[PDB]
């Protein structure tokens, strides 16, 4: 009978976390430049509530937008670990996805998914600001739906147990 309360509060919590998705001000390369372009007037992330916070403690989203090197992989892992829960990960660009242009390099991790778990991938090089906004909006929709995906079954009285 506790499901009567949590499910509306589940919806409220999901709406609150999707309406204040704060990503970490952490960019690396041309992908970071396009990420900055995805914040300014033309494509306003503030419309969906996406405002950048400078510290991982105050950030819900880790936006890995750039090339991850072997000299940086421990840094990215530490940044992911120090981010307060719940947290999601968006890999923007071919370098973050699977290495991209530098996949055959001696000092490239060949994807940030080898270091930290990635929740969503945006493929472009660089992804357009529209592509990044699409990825962010899809991630917000998914994390809104992730609190209750129907895992709990329904008994004879249609209340999840």
């Amino acid at each position: 009978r506790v499901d009567y309360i949590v499910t509306p509060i589940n919806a409220v919590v999901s709406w609150a976390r999707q309406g204040s998705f704060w990503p970490l001000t952490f960019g690396l390369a041309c992908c970071a430049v396009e990420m900055m372009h995805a914040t300014v007037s033309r494509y306003d992330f503030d419309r969906f509530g996406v405002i950048f916070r400078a510290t991982p403690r105050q950030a819900d989203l880790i936006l890995v937008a750039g090339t991850l090197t072997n000299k940086m992989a421990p840094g990215l892992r530490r940044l992911y670990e120090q981010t307060l829960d719940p947290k999601w990960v968006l890999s923007m660009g071919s370098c973050a996805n699977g290495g991209g242009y530098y996949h055959y390099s001696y000092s490239v991790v060949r994807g940030c998914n080898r270091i930290i778990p990635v929740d969503i991938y945006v493929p472009g090089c660089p992804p357009t600001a529209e592509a990044l906004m699409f990825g962010v909006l899809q991630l917000q929709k998914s994390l809104y739906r992730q609190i209750n995906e129907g895992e709990k079954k329904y008994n004879k009285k249609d209340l999840t147990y």
């Binding site: 699977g98 080898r114 778990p117 895992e151």
Partner: protein, 340 residues
């Protein structure tokens, strides 16, 4: 026999290699799941993780995705656990099945504890008996599993052992003794309880219960060695540490390593049982925790040991001292210790 237990795999590879192990790990969203997946996945093996874990954004599933590289690790979401079709699909292209599903310590209802252990283990074993391509089935139970155990978890784990051995006779029943690590429920629970009370750790008995802690890395090595040995098929291996300690001795060792003075505040066992039975139970407060505190979980010598699968476990003082670095007591120290 007509079901081959042979598992020829190459363990000399790395993350981006191929070992030949296709494994489905049920119940990997807990504590030992990520480590078992990493042990399988770090030699270049395909690993599937069925799960129905609520709050899919928890770090457990995401770190499960990190057990193997891209194209090797797959995560099944919304596993029914009551669908024979789903069980068949989960192990369709797998020759290794590792069942870590067990009643959580938070649970106190016998029917739900019986459900998870007995029902899920029986269904997994039956599915393994219908797919001829499955070579090995490793089922994880607890060390103090017996039908007379007061704990529903241990009782239903003994029942699950029997059910798995009946359905899939070539199974390997692992019974680890108090696995500890970083995301464990032993050292992490000790640290969190001592930090939340700040004055003591709550004990509900004389703390004379025997513990034989074993490192999670050692457990993963045991799994790999069991996969490397055909003699382990259909056998019971108890995975204990090098030595046996009481709960009082474990508290003393943790206190000595961390430097925190050990304060053990006693509460009557009957009162603790009443309040845990009649109130909501979560990870840090449960009748299962109380009962296991009043039970011995060690190697009883009735079956094969960790030495039979040839893993030399590290000492509990060594492992704990590795895992208590940042919770150390800050007493009087050298000026050279200021620079960290």
């Amino acid at each position: 026999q007509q079901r081959s237990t042979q598992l020829k795999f190459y363990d000399g590879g790395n993350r981006q290699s191929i070992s030949g192990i296709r494994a489905t790990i049920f119940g990997a969203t807990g504590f030992m799941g990520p480590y078992i997946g990493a042990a399988l996945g770090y030699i270049g093996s395909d690993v599937i993780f069925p799960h129905n874990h609520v709050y899919a954004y928890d770090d457990y599933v995401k770190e499960l995705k990190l057990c193997a590289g891209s194209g090797q690790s797959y995560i099944m979401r919304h596993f029914n656990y009551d669908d024979d079709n789903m069980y068949d699909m989960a192990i369709k292209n797998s020759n290794v099945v590792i069942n870590l599903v067990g009643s959580r310590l938070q649970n106190k209802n016998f029917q739900k504890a019986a459900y998870a252990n007995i029902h899920v283990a029986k269904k997994i074993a039956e599915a393994c008996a219908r797919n001829p391509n499955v070579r090995r089935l490793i089922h994880f139970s607890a060390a103090g599993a017996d039908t007379k155990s007061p704990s529903p978890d241990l009782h239903t784990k003994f029942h699950g052992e029997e059910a798995v051995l009946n359905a899939f006779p070539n199974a390997t029943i692992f019974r680890p003794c108090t696995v500890y690590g970083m995301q464990d429920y032993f050292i992490r629970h000790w640290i969190k309880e001592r930090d939340w009370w700040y004055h003591f750790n709550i004990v509900t008995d004389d703390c004379t219960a025997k513990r034989q802690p074993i490192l999670i890395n050692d457990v993963a090595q045991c799994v790999l060695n069991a996969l490397k040995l055909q003699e382990s098929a259909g056998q019971i291996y108890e995975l204990g540490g090098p030595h046996v300690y009481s709960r009082l001795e474990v508290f003393e060792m943790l206190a000595n390593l961390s430097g925190r003075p050990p304060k053990l505040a006693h509460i009557p066992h009957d009162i603790a049982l009443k309040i845990t039975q009649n109130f909501y139970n979560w990870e840090f407060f449960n009748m299962e925790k109380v009962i296991k505190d009043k039970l011995d979980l060690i190697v009883t010598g009735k079956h094969k040991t960790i030495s039979d699968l040839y893993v030399q476990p590290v000492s509990f003082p060594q492992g704990a001292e590795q895992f208590i670095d940042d919770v150390r007591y800050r007493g009087v120290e050298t000026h050279d210790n200021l620079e960290k």
